[PDB]
Amino acid sequence: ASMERFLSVYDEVQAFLLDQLQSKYEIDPNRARYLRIMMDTTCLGGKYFRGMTVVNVAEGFLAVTQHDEATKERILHDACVGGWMIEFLQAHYLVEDDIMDGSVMRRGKPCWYRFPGVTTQCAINDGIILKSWTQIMAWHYFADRPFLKDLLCLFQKVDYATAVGQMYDVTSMCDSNKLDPEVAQPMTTDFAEFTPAIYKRIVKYKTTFYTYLLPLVMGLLVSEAAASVEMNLVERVAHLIGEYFQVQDDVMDCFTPPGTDIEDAKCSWLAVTFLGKANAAQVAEFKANYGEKDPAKVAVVKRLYSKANLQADFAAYEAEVVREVESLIEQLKVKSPTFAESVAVVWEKTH
Amino acid sequence: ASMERFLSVYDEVQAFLLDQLQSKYEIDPNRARYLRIMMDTTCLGGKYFRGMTVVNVAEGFLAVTQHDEATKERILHDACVGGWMIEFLQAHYLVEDDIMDGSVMRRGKPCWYRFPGVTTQCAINDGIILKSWTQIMAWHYFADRPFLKDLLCLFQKVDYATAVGQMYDVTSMCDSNKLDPEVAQPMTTDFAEFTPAIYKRIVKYKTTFYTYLLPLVMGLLVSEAAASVEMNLVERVAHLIGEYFQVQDDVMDCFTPPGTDIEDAKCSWLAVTFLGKANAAQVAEFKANYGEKDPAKVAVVKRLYSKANLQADFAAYEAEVVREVESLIEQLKVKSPTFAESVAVVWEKTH
Ligand SMILES: Nc1ccc(Oc2ccc(F)cc2)cn1
Ligand SMILES: Nc1ccc(Oc2ccc(F)cc2)cn1
Ligand SMILES: Nc1ccc(Oc2ccc(F)cc2)cn1
Ligand SMILES: Nc1ccc(Oc2ccc(F)cc2)cn1
Ligand SMILES: [Zn+2]
Ligand SMILES: [Zn+2]
């Protein structure tokens, strides 16, 4: 089974990283134990959607391509290592984002920096090490692979796009013309930048490149299958599915039982959609209550969202995405029914 | 002049990075201005010792190698880009380290995260972008270069060694056997881990790889001159000069007029050297006062250092380093008098 193989590769990669720290970086057993716990706490516990997508894509191509058994094993092992590079990249994002946002919990457990023996002083560096480990993995396991150059180049472009996206996200409640390192940033009063196009730019860069584009393209790279696809279509379908995924996360932050998007004045799908249909009085009530810690004001915003019938707007949004995704999957079938099926599976798991 | 060329390349690299953000990352003019100011504030103002070392090494080889004028220009341009990759890597370290340590000032100016319109929320991400820019630079300017693979591999090993070193440094006042993410870390009471070998490990990883090894090896890589050297000697001389550089920085933190190493209980050269010669009563007075914010206790520690005649220990340390560096430079002369002269210049600038 794919998951059994994926989890076995984690144990192998962890042992490699920790043994390398001992033989080449003069690490002592106690610091190796601290890093082992850090790696387990930050990398494990999720559903492994991103890492498993690499494995599923590679498995698809193995079913329709002739290979010796040793080659099939090498491809699957490469897909598992590539998948862990993405999972560790996500771990890096989550550790740093939780510190930047002053988050409390991450998956019903305290954020890494909040652990008593961690603290922000170590946690920022722990997040830096998580990302360095993605590169150590790549250079060690893929040293002689023909796809090494393409995989490293794609990985840094995705990483940089994600960092740019984090900047778009954290500055989404500022008026762009007021951005200035010398002057403390006031929250927007007109909310003129809370538009569908601006929201789409935040989501595209902060989530879609690493959650959807990177796992799909890595699966193609380790399979030596980039010719079975039109890269403009892969990008188009990844950004579309990714946007839908973030819209779902935005809805959950507000309505799923234990989120601080309202208090943080985030440019969420809910605030943008609400502002796109609100009358003069509703806009005024939104402005008087948004981006405030006061629970009474948060309740006013949630109530405005509830009475605005945003469930109908979400249903219409969902219908349009289902429509466009189905269209892109059909266009993907021209060059590869195998790859189009992997995308269909990713969509099913998202939808 | 080398410095004029180096500074002209900064303007070219900055324009490239910001133009790429506009054409490929959908950036708006205000966010591009914020990133331009961030880049200037974090990357400029220093002596450019690390970046200029790449240029000086390349200039040395140009004087003894036959090349067309266009090739000389390409090599110098590559040395300048490589030098800026190191300067931006340093900028990344300084931004993140200043946040982790809660530092106030950096070169008589507030630390980046302390700027009113920055804050920790943006500054951690700004430091991440500084490092991503080193990779964007490499992939764009060195895309067709034969040294691209070696340069990227060397750069990530150095970066990872530096992150490991930061961990060694920030945990240097903890008892290793007590390291535990679940338990708040008490400061050491016996100071058994304040030894020359442990101090040497901190310095080797936190400073020497990126300050001395990386600029020297990058200069060799852009010059296609790795055969003019024995890499074991380059590593040995880089770690030796690097250790001396950190010992100088440790002395300055305590005695150079405006440092918090004493209050932070850092495993500095001064604390290690003091403990290596102190009697029973002096050790007890050190333990009762070290790692405390109280200015009265800091003064007791400085006084213990002053009466311990650490200036004589520094003079004896300096004499041994001068001796060993001269020896290594002589061993470097066997394969390259040109490279040995560049190392002699680096030593002169350090000493
Ligand atoms: N797999 C693994 C776990 C921990 C580890 O750390 C060590 C450090 C110094 C030693 F001397 C021995 C072990 C090395 N490898
Ligand atoms: N859920 C999420 C939020 C933000 C994100 O992007 C970054 C995170 C930390 C960073 F340091 C840089 C980018 C990725 N995922
Ligand atoms: N050299 C440079 C400086 C700033 C910059 O930012 C822009 C963003 C969006 C635009 F439409 C125009 C410029 C681009 N390049
Ligand atoms: N002066 C100095 C201190 C520490 C240092 O290393 C790091 C810094 C930040 C990091 F996030 C990781 C490593 C480099 N230079
Ligand atoms: Zn965030
Ligand atoms: Zn520090």
Phi, psi of B109 (to 5 degrees): -125, 155
DSSP B68: -
- A165 CA to middle of ligand 5, Å? 10
Residues in chain B within 8 Å Cβ distance of A150:
none
Answer whether B30 sits within 8 Å of A176, measured CB to CB.
Answer: yes
Number of compact structural domains in chain B? 1
User: Is A28 at the interface with chain B, CB within 8 A?
Assistant: yes
The whole-angstrom separation of Cα A302 and Cα B222 is: 59
* Burial degree of A227 (CB within 10 A; 0-12, 13-18, 19+): exposed
For this entry, resolution in Å reads 1.8
Experimental method, per PDB record: X-ray
Burial of B84 (0-12, 13-18, 19+ CB in 10 A): buried
C-alpha to C-alpha distance for A31 and A248, rounded to whole angstroms: 39
CB B59 within 8 A of CB B2: yes
Which residue, among A152, A275, A301, A294, has the nearest Cα to A218 in the 3D structure? A152
Tell me, yes or no, if A23 comes closer than 8 A to chain B by beta carbon. no
How many helices (DSSP H) and strands (DSSP E) are in chain A?
Answer: 14, 0
Cα of B306 to nearest chain A Cα, Å: 31
User: Is the Cβ–Cβ distance between A140 and A109 less than 8 Å?
Assistant: no
**Closest by CA position to A29, among listed A38, A39, A18:** A18
A143 phi and psi angles, rounded to 5 deg = -45, -45
Alpha-carbon dihedral angle through residues A247, A130, B125, B39, given to the nearest 10 degrees: -140
What are the distances in angstroms from CA B29 to CA A204, B36, B133?
19, 10, 18
User: Residue A160: which of B131, B11, B38 has the closest Cα?
Assistant: B131
Instruction: Yes or no: say if A301 and A286 are a contact pair by the CB < 8 Å rule.
Output: yes
**Which ligand sits nearest to residue B166's alpha carbon?**
4
Residue B155 burial by CB count (10 A; 0-12/13-18/19+): exposed, middle or buried? buried
Q: Are the C-beta atoms of residues A205 and A171 closer than 8 Å to each other?
A: no
First to last CA, chain B: 24
Task: Calculate how close chain A gets to B60, using CA atoms only, in Å.
Answer: 31
Range of the structural domain that residue A290 is part of: 1-351
Please report the residues numbered 3 through 22 in chain A whose beta carbons come closer than 8 angstroms to any beta carbon of chain B.
21
Strand segments, DSSP code E, in chain A are none
SS3 B26: coil
Sequence-distant (6+) residues with CB within 8 A of A8 are none
